[PDB]
Amino acid sequence: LNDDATFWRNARHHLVRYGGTFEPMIIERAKGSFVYDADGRAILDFTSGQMSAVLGHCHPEIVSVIGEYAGKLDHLFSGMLSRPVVDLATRLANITPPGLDRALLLSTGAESNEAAIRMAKLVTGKYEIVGFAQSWHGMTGAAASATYSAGRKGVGPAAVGSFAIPAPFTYRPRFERNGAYDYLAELDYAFDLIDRQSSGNLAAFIAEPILSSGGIIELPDGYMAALKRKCEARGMLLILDEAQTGVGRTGTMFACQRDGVTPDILTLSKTLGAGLPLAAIVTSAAIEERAHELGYLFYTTHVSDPLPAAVGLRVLDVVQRDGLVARANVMGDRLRRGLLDLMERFDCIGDVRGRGLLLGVEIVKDRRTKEPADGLGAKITRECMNLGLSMNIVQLPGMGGVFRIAPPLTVSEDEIDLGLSLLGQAIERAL
Amino acid sequence: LNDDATFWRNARHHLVRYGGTFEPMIIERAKGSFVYDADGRAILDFTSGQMSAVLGHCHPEIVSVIGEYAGKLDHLFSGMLSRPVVDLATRLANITPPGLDRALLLSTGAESNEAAIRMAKLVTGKYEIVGFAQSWHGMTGAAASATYSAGRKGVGPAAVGSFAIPAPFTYRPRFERNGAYDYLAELDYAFDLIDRQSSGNLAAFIAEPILSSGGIIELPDGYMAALKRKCEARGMLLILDEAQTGVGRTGTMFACQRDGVTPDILTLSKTLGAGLPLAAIVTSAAIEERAHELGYLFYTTHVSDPLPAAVGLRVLDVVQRDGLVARANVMGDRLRRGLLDLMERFDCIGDVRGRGLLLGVEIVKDRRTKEPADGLGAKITRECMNLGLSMNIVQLPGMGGVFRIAPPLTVSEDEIDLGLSLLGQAIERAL
Amino acid sequence: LNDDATFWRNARHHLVRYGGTFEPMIIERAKGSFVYDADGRAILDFTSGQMSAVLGHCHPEIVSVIGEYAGKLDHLFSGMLSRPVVDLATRLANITPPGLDRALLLSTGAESNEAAIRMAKLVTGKYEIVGFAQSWHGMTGAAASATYSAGRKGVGPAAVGSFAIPAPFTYRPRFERNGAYDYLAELDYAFDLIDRQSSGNLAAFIAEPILSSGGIIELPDGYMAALKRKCEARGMLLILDEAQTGVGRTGTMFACQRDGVTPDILTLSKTLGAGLPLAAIVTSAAIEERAHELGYLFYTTHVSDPLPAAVGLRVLDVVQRDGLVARANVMGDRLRRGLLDLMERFDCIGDVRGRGLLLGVEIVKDRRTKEPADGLGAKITRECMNLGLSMNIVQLPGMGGVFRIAPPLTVSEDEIDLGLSLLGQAIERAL
Amino acid sequence: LNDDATFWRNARHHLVRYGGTFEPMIIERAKGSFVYDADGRAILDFTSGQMSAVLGHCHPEIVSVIGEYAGKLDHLFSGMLSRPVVDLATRLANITPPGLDRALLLSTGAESNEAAIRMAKLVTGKYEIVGFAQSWHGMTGAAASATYSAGRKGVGPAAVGSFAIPAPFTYRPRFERNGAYDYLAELDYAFDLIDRQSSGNLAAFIAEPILSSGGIIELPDGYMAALKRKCEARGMLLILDEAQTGVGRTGTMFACQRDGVTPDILTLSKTLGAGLPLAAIVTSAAIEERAHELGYLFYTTHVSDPLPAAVGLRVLDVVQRDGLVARANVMGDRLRRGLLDLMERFDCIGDVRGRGLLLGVEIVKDRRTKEPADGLGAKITRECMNLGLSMNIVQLPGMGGVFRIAPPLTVSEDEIDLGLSLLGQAIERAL
Ligand SMILES: *Cc1c(COP(=O)(O)O)cnc(C)c1O
Ligand SMILES: *Cc1c(COP(=O)(O)O)cnc(C)c1O
Ligand SMILES: *Cc1c(COP(=O)(O)O)cnc(C)c1O
Ligand SMILES: *Cc1c(COP(=O)(O)O)cnc(C)c1O
Ligand SMILES: [Li+]
Ligand SMILES: [Li+]
Ligand SMILES: [Li+]
Ligand SMILES: [Li+]
Ligand code: NA
Ligand code: NA
Ligand code: NA
Ligand code: NA
To answer: Which residues carry the post-translational modification N6-(pyridoxal phosphate)lysine, per the record (chains A, B, C, D)?
Structure first.
């Protein structure tokens, strides 16, 4: 049973609470798109853990490579190169757009964003960073100052020079020009303000292609292109954080590929490691040269370590080989149509957005008022769990709670169906 | 051969340079206290990689546990608990001093320090952080603002509220009271200044027990106790960063155990993971309760993940079981005596400091003037490498270059001897 | 002649240039609404010097009081009270709205704003200050961090916690709701953003009732009331800077009186001194009590000095006695109608705004496109000067150059007429 | 009587308390070295008001010039030059050392320091400012961030980039080298620390020649020269704040003249105005040229106003003409010898320091322990007042209360004697 008294004793006495509330189960094993409790019950992981497990739990190839490497090459002094590091770096250069040539292999998303932000400050000589008011870039330092989706309060002043602009949100537009939501005019309006407060030290803009923590908000068409134009005019670098979108999840290898705008620096993390801690930054040779001439430094205990790199390489090989990016469109299409059907059934479903296998469902009081449903989300989540479907909801000020759906790229048709089915039942049970 | 043209091509074209300069070898395999090149040459890892590999490379127990877990339980949603997480947290509570009860399991040293700094700000309501002028806490954000050993220049303003005090350095004392280096009077002098610049928001003091990046500088006797007293008087938390000293390296499970001063928050990392990315913070129940009531939040992709936790547990079991902490004193004694003998032979060796198996050798022009040797260090390092001994030197302003020695806790007598031997030969060759 | 070689030599060699460019005349004497050059030429001061001389130059009453006091009571130790200080403080309490009871007598506008900002931080315990993107509060410190109309660039980071919102500008509206410029919706939009970046330390909002440096921009109807509501909801103080509007200039003793919103702190300066350096803050007893309990401190060399206070009192007596506030409406009406007529004549005149005797004339390429006229303003100004009419233009990004008109409250009908006449001639000459 | 009920009513109801506590008298008239109460009682102003009245109260020449100008030329638009401004600027260039050529005429000490700090940031491109831990530069903005003698607490974070070093204090030395207070070694020690925390943006160092608010602490011999050397090596400007020392008070026209070190920027204020608000910055032509090319801007309502400038000129003429700088040495010698005699009489007098007519008397429990006398100072001050001698004491952490003595430069022998006499009586009465 999940009701182990010692287990729970020990958990209450010795774990630091870090947000949220522990599920009341003891996970004992994981495989593919499911996690199992102590009773053996199978729970469908519709979030890929913490949005990372792109190939599902314990994929045999990964299992196999972790294996080879753990007994052969594990961790090395930062100045020592090995084959997996060089192969992964090369691989990343080749599959990202032209213009992205050089990589730095790290451990976490926050490290990746820091490394990027540091390079951009060095290279430009400036220090002001601009991000979205609904961003999520990580909890450590700079990444944290650039994070506006949560954690700003009660912890003292943020980094000097941090500005934020509102992110384009089509579902609840707030900026109108001639009777229509004009998101590009909004962009212009936001930049003008920035321009007014800057001390003349704009160094970069950090953005997510699809704001995940922010409520699965997709930057609309033409946005990115205009964004990049705003940056160019001001001599700012554009850093794209693809922690959640990279590695096939939205139907393209990288989300930037859809828009056709290649950033100055690209950061990857969650999905690169497929569950393990691996992260990276990819930049142009020009930028790297300059940062080097300038004395750029970024040391971490695990930069360029063999084991993690080996793993990331294997992840890319699988994704490529098995056509997982394509699968993401097909499965994503399947899931999306099902969610639409749900929306036909229940008025509480106010919106279904996202791309590929990175979908959001905004729950609302009523489809016309678009009033956020107070407490329903949590019911729904609860019931899901009872029904065996792992979900994650996010609630932001001014918005209805949002379900972040993001199954493994290896998810099967049946699992998509099962999930859709349990989701329906949970909602019906919750009203 | 290490001279693979494709390999090197690819490395020059696709890797971001992050400090230092890549060794010109291709590491192909690692085992115990040695790494091997493409030619099969065995190099004695006297740094344990990046000071992490406490049990050496590819230790079979570790290999075996990485194994069990990679195929059973890998990565989970942050709100789901598992046995390895709870067991590791419990274990950490039990082997750290009384007063340290609750743990947070993360991935890196910088994350660990951030998590700690954030809690301390929350809990105290203040935001000013004090650290040493020679500290190393990591590159991301807050950790970085608290880091004074390197990376402060060219990257824009540091975090608001950062102060630094000089660290007690017995080898090159600079504060005298009545004819003697009075490090406690120095402490008083430093705090007075702080007190003058503070805005009245002192929240914490972050320190390393033995400054690693700073040149293997050990806080002298009675220092820590006075430090903690300074903090108490000002309502500040004392955070101890044991990334390099924790887990048996200096001859005690934790360095704080030698002094008998238990910190408010303890952070661990390099040696906990033994080469993998695992880190953690350990605090008192009181502090945790408060941070919780206050709404403390710290999310990371890999917080509480099963695999890494499993590994850390196995590391502790080995260290305990095999009496590695004791071994550290015995081997450490062996290495230290050898280094002293070298110092008998060569006048360039100005000091031999450190504890257990965390030793520093300061190279100087001349033993009396204590003038830093300009360029000798690098020669020596070069020769070492040629001789098959992996070393790492650090050079700080105003000090002679320092060799950081830190072999695996599983290092054998022979390896200690071999190392001592190659070191002698390299120095003789370098003059 | 104004062409004194020694004079000009000395000026080029020994004066620090601080912005702008010195007029090429030597002012020798000033009287009423005119200044005279070395040739004796009379120039009509349509700016009241630097918008301060509310009673004109060298008003006999002022002359007379400066006189009595300079030989009787001049400057005293900060802790010594005198009658003029107490009488001025009392007077200010009585003529400002209910709710404003206690005053602090200083020397400059920037000091006044600093004193206010400091009190607001003390009293609230918070530190974030919000201001307008087109504000002007002074050059020293906090006032400067709150100043967004100019001087942000090239001088290093601004004060931590500074935010700015766009100011309502009816002439060039940019925020639309349902086909109309909705300035209150803009306000809501701006605050939401603030709310997102704040660290939870909003202490105050500083605003001008009529943005002077910003281009003579009047806060529209209902704005101030909504502003104050925004502040109340967030526990923020509302500080009103009436340096240019206070003391009768816009037709009410204080501009806040028109809207009926009384601020938490009111600051006065330019017009209080009528040309001399006198400034002040007026707050409620409650706020003062609290700041006192909290240990509020604000020392300046000239706080509570007799001479300046004596002068300010005399200024208020004159304004009251001679009905200068009323006169401001009558004369203001006269000037405004004339400016409108000009606007009938010349298409370059795009807007005539302002209140009382604080008027702005925005010069534009063309009345429909509203394109800013590039260089015309300067011509016009030049010609004015030649014609004997002292003017001042301001040019802000995105706006047409703006003429700041602001004659003495003692200005006569003839002088208004003369001015209108020279202005017409200069424009005709400039096209 | 001083017991006017209405007066006191009005003062309690309408004045903002800004530090300290109002003396319980009503000052009605002032003349020379005395102020008079409502009862006509003459009080000997041994502080020159707030250390400003260098020529005493209501000096006839000043009275006479305030007169001429108030009715002729009062306040003008910032871009209009007049003779008093140019004459004062020229005068300042001529009487300050070679290297100081260009002046900016303002209103207050804080404005002066801001203007200076802004220029130094512009010209160097950097932003970090260094000052003394016991400094006093004013309350507004930058000046305030550089002020460490008081007001740092409870008002939010200081300006980014502010550092402070300890000031050399011979009476209570704390840094020893080879058995002696080595203040230059202290300087080296302090800079090293700075160097460690800087982000590489050191722009200037701001110092007072004799720390006034800090307890009348004189920078010892050779200090300034070493200071300036420290700055040069780091490409930093050295700004000297002579608000209290300038204009003859310490026996030289400017204190910098004694040491022979000419600063990059010199600021003046209290004594320049002799009681009125006049201030100024004096810099080299090179620095001014550069700041101009860079777009330096510094606008204030009263920059370059005629009246105040006229006054400052007259002050310099008097000081020069009447040989007041010399008188300061003679009178200063008289006062100092008397204070020494007191020190012979009473063990509570621990030190007599200062120069010219800027003297400090540190009261202590006991001459050997040097323990600060708790409460005696206040008694003494109280008695003085009763005896008719206006005094001012300052109390800093770790020091005995200090009496700031600073009579007018026009003080007579008799007044010096009287003062010495009342001081003795008050101390005798206080024990
Ligand atoms: C998760 C995430 C990060 C940070 O990754 P961590 O491993 O949590 O440090 C950064 N950006 C985005 C968009 C993320 O989703
Ligand atoms: C290495 C180190 C850290 C940071 O660990 P990373 O894995 O590099 O983020 C923090 N503190 C000390 C003392 C360290 O040695
Ligand atoms: C002029 C002005 C100030 C500052 O006054 P100074 O005397 O220049 O310091 C502040 N606010 C407003 C609105 C001003 O017009
Ligand atoms: C008084 C003083 C100032 C500031 O002058 P204010 O008129 O108070 O603004 C600056 N520096 C020193 C050394 C002072 O004594
Ligand atoms: Li490594
Ligand atoms: Li997890
Ligand atoms: Li005064
Ligand atoms: Li003027
Ligand atoms: Na590429
Ligand atoms: Na413990
Ligand atoms: Na009132
Ligand atoms: Na000079």
So the answer is: 270
